[PDB]
Amino acid sequence: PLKVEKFATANRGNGLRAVTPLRPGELLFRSDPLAYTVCKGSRGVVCDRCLLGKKLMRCSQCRVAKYCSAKCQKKAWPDHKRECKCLKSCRYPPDSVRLLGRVVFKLMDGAPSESEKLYSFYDLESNINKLTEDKKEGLRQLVMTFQHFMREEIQDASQLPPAFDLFEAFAKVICNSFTICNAEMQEVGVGLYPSISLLNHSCDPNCSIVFNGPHLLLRAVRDIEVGEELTICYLDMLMTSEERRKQLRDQYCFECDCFRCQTQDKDADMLTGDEQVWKEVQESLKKIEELKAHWKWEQVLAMCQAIISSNSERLPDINIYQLKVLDCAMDACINLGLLEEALFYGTRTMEPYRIFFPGSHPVRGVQVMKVGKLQLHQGMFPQAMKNLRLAFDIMRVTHGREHSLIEDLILLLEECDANIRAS
Ligand SMILES: NCc1ccc(S(=O)(=O)N2CCC(NC(=O)c3cc(C4CC4)on3)CC2)cc1
Ligand SMILES: C[S@@+](CC[C@H](N)C(=O)[O-])C[C@H]1O[C@@H](n2cnc3c(N)ncnc32)[C@H](O)[C@@H]1O
Ligand SMILES: [Mg+2]
Ligand SMILES: [Mg+2]
Ligand SMILES: [Zn+2]
Ligand SMILES: [Zn+2]
Ligand SMILES: [Zn+2]
Numbered sequence: 001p002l003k004v005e006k007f008a009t010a011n012r013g014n015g016l017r018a019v020t021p022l023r024p025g026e027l028l029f030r031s032d033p034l035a036y037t038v039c040k041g042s043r044g045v046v047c048d049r050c051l052l053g054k055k056l057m058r059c060s061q062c063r064v065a066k067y068c069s070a071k072c073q074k075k076a077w078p079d080h081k082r083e084c085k086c087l088k089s090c091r092y093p094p095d096s097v098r099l100l101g102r103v104v105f106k107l108m109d110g111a112p113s114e115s116e117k118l119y120s121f122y123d124l125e126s127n128i129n130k131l132t133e134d135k136k137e138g139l140r141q142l143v144m145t146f147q148h149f150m151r152e153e154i155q156d157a158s159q160l161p162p163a164f165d166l167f168e169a170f171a172k173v174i175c176n177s178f179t180i181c182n183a184e185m186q187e188v189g190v191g192l193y194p195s196i197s198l199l200n201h202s203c204d205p206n207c208s209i210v211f212n213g214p215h216l217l218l219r220a221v222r223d224i225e226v227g228e229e230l231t232i233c234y235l236d237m238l239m240t241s242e243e244r245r246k247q248l249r250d251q252y253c254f255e256c257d258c259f260r261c262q263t264q265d266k267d268a269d270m271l272t273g274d275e276q277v278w279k280e281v282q283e284s285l286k287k288i289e290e291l292k293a294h295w296k297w298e299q300v301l302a303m304c305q306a307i308i309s310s311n312s313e314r315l316p317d318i319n320i321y322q323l324k325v326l327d328c329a330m331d332a333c334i335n336l337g338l339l340e341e342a343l344f345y346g347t348r349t350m351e352p353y354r355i356f357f358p359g360s361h362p363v364r365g366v367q368v369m370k371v372g373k374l375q376l377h378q379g380m381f382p383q384a385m386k387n388l389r390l391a392f393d394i395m396r397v398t399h400g401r402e403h404s405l406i407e408d409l410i411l412l413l414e415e416c417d418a419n420i421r422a423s
Contacts, residue, residue: 004028004230006118006198012254013125015229016118016198022224024360025397028207029195029218034115035079035102036180036191036214039095041293049076050213051180051188053295062087079106085152093149095190096173097142101150103169103192107161118195122161125197126171130253135174142170175252180211183405184331185366187293189214201252202231203244203260210362212403221360221397237356237363238320240267266356273315273322281307281321288328297332304329308345318352327367334370343374350387365394369409376412381419388413 003022009015022028038048046053047068056066057073064087065080067073082105083098093101103121106113131139143166147154154160176197180189193216196209206222207230224230234252235244241264248256259265271278284303291299304325308314315322326345333342349367357364372387392409399406 002029002118004118007229009200009229012200014119014123014198015200017227017229018224019226021226022220024221024223025400026220027217027400027402028220028230029118030402031115031193031196031216031218032113033178033180033191033193033214033216034113034121035099035106036189037095037098037102038189039180039187039293040092041290042186042188042295043092045295046182046188047072048080049073051182051211052213053182059084061085064088064092079110082109082153086150089152090149093145094142096170096177097146097149099177099190099192100146100166100169100173101153103173104150104154104160104164107164108159115192116194119198121169121172121192121194124172124176124194126168127175127253128168128171131171135250136167139167139170139174143167146170178209178216180214180216183212183366183408184334184370185363186295186331191216199230199232201234201248201254201256203233203235203241203256203258203265204358205231205233207232208360208362208398210399210403212405217400217402219398219400237361238270238324240270240320241265242267269318269355270320273319274313277313277315278319278321281315281319281325285321285324285328288325292328292331295335297335300328301332301336301338304332317348318355320356323349323352323356330370334374339374339377343371343378346371346374360394360397362395362398365391365398366405368394369405369412372416373412376416376419379419381416381423385413385416385420388416 003018003020004016005019006014007017038046044056044066047056048065049067049072052068054068056068059065062084067076079102083101086101146166176192178191178193179187180191182188191214196216196218206220206224207218208221209216209218209232235247241261244256248254284307288300288303307325308329317323317326326349330342330345333345350371353364353367368387369391372384372391375384375387392413395406395409
């Protein structure tokens with residue numbers, strides 16, 4: 001019996017609303033993707049199928065798809081078989097083109113997907129009548145890129161779903177793509193989850209999604225009344241209202257009416273410090289984030305240290321650009337085994353994260369868990385326990401028992417508690 005239902009909103013198209021009262025942490029829907037792929041930077045770093053990092057085995061035919069195990073390579077074959085001949089034949093396509101290829105193959109060759117239970121690819125919003133000419137030109141180039149990439153497998157409309165229009169399909173992709181994140185909150189893939197696509201956006205949402213490999217869990221993060229619309233935040237929380245406005249216009253074709261956008265909620269705190277410094281850090285973050293997307297941790301760390309410990313002027317840790325640098329440095333340190341330095345950066349992020357991730361947000365839950373884990377392994381048992389319990393309080397809501405990371409957290413809590421009891 002579903003706790004959610006599709007409905008027609010007054011001014012935001014279709015949406016999802018609660019059928020029953022919902023409490024924080026309640027699992028509302030779970031879904032595998034209709035189609036998904038690894039993102040360009042994680043290609044060859046994580047398994048194409050399960051999206052875990054490993055030391056990967058490549059598909060011998062295309063040598064593009066890479067896998068953690070024979071199980072994953074073999075299980076991925078039915079959904080990889082047709083794209084394999086295309087990847088071989090061609091130059092690597094934009095993620096959206098690889099994704100749409102997988103959409104087409106799934107719709108043509110696969111049984112009806114549970115991911116389409118509430119809403120299908122065919123139903124998705126295209127926003128075509130809101131696209132500006134520059135966006136239409138970009139979509140036309142994507143169409144032509146798809147036609148080139150897919151030519152070994154799709155030569156005519158007979159090989160697309162009935163009356164499938166590639167321009168419209170890419171228009172849907174742009175406003176319906178989910179960024180799949182691994183357990184550590186590294187972006188690793190992109191997917192379409194058409195039932196989940198019913199959720200409209202809020203900058204202060206009542207639900208949240210989290211990924212466990214390709215699998216998506218939708219949970220309430222506030223109390224929700226019968227009939228109330230369910231929302232998620234499509235965006236990183238570490239964004240000003242101007243940045244949100246740009247992304248919601250450019251990618252989603254809407255103007256956000258939430259209270260936060262009307263009042264520039266938190267913008268001024270997010271932009272504290274000297275503007276010339278944070279403008280330079282924001283510019284450096286383009287390169288830092290590009291390096292991070294490719295798992296280049298040593299280079300990430302070097303760039304971050306040059307900011308965090310700059311000889312030149314510095315930023316407060318609440319400035320969002322400084323905060324993003326701290327977080328990249330922490331993750332680089334964790335992945336590099338520099339656990340004392342990781343804890344220094346991670347600890348600094350804790351109060352800004354408390355402010356910018358109000359309520360229960362999976363990114364804060366994960367960050368607090370990382371900090372608690374670092375403290376636990378440094379023997380700081382009471383401090384680790386407070387953070388691990390805080391992470392559990394958040395992650396019971398945002399992740400829940402169905403997400404494997406919660407089991408890892410429970411292990412840390414038991415280890416930490418055992419230490420405290422032996423002290
Ligand atoms: N610095 C890395 C980072 C990792 C994780 C997050 S997150 O967990 O907060 N989060 C991921 C999911 C994303 N949302 C989507 O991709 C998305 C797409 C849509 C609908 C289909 C348009 O709804 N959510 C919104 C940000 C933020 C930054
Ligand atoms: C993932 S879909 C959400 C479901 C969509 N309303 C539909 O009818 O299919 C994203 C699109 O929904 C609309 N949208 C989402 N959140 C909105 C909001 N807060 N205000 C207005 N439109 C919104 C925009 O058209 C956006 O591109
Ligand atoms: Mg429509
Ligand atoms: Mg419309
Ligand atoms: Zn795998
Ligand atoms: Zn292959
Ligand atoms: Zn808003």
